[PDB]
Subunit: 273 residues, 2 copies
Amino acid sequence: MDLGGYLTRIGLDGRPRPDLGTLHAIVAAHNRSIPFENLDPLLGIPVADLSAEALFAKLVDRRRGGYQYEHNGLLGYVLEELGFEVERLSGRVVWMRADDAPLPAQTHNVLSVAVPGADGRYLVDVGFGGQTLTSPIRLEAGPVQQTRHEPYRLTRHGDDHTLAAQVRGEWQPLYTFTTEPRPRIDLEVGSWYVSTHPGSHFVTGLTVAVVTDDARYNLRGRNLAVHRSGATEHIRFDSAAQVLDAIVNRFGIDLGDLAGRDVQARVAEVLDT
Amino acid sequence: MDLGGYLTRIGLDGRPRPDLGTLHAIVAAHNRSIPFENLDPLLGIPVADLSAEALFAKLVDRRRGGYQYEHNGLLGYVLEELGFEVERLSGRVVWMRADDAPLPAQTHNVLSVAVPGADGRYLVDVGFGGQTLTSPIRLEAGPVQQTRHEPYRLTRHGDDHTLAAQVRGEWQPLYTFTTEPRPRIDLEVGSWYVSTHPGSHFVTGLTVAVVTDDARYNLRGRNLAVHRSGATEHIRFDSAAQVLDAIVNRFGIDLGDLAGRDVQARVAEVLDT
């Protein structure tokens, strides 16, 4: 594949080896280089094709970001090519959901990754957005595990795992998942739903995110949240133009890709959704 | 009156001539260089002495900021020494007060400045905090006047003037005042009230502010608001430690003269007040 293109995109060079050190370095570089964004579903463009060709073309060659299926799909292919053993998993997002809420749809995709020298498996997820994992963690229920940012924890009931993050001193469940490997088509059916259902969070508004060594950035509509050590920031943009400026210059997304779609007018509709 | 310390403090040099250009330059330099702060009243230290000796020693020599009486007190002495003619005025703060609110106390102090060779007088106020005037304006009721930032406007009913600012598109009355010149003692009585009454805004919590060319900054307790072109920001500090960090490193306040008074514990008490 075009790993050279991917490695350049994320600010690495040369062929890295399939070891744990490389896994950490790639996750960190991906985190800071390729943003989470849902401009395609926002603009009525489905995310239907999760092939390597499609994902490299968009997230690497066209300097766009993507959402969960695009991020982890891409990284899945990259890690495989490099020599890691990769299974694609699906999950249900429970973030900020009430204790008694209906069961969510399977709308997430994460990776279970092994190094050739079988020291168990690692959860890898660079596609959850602003609160995405910034390190690989051991796919092992029980222990609190440190990362490049906040502590995270896996717990399980049978094969139903829950990933939680310690967000500003408070533990928050993010999503649940099983370890049953999923074929690409089942991920594509999920992605069709998330990118086209008129009630989908990723159809009804705009989410853009990126994570640097120092901070998590998460834009929803006009509202940019920043979580840094010791402080939160909330930046409220006045209008769609400022949002578009942030998209291009803060988040590094080329909107030339979306010529003739009236991005600015659609962003205006979702400032507060 | 040595003015060299003051001029260095605000990032100017030499001896500027008492003209309109100098008045604009000094206001702008003061705005960015000496912050609004009420650390003394917060810590039970009254602001009682508005002599040149007291105000220069604190706001210049000790690299502290100050509140309304200290700012406009200091600038009044500076402007007189340079060859301007200065009257000190008092006023009542009406910002965000209901139409049927009781009459406020006289808690503000502003300057009416005559520039040699120029008609009329100029309102100068570098002590109102985050929304303080960033240009001198003509002390003339009626016309909308441009500043380095937003438009401001004086209006008059009898001898009571109202200063208003167009804040993010909305006209907001800030304070009322008369043009009766005030003796220092009457200002000191006001400052005694503002710095010692247990219900005073400047006794019950922490207020720090500064204004740069690009933004207005206003901190209350743990909450920093920023108004800039196209956006507002709200930064929430985790604890007093980060607030003190901001006081020293962002606002440039030397806390050395407060050694031995446990500034951090007092700030901790008022993060949410």
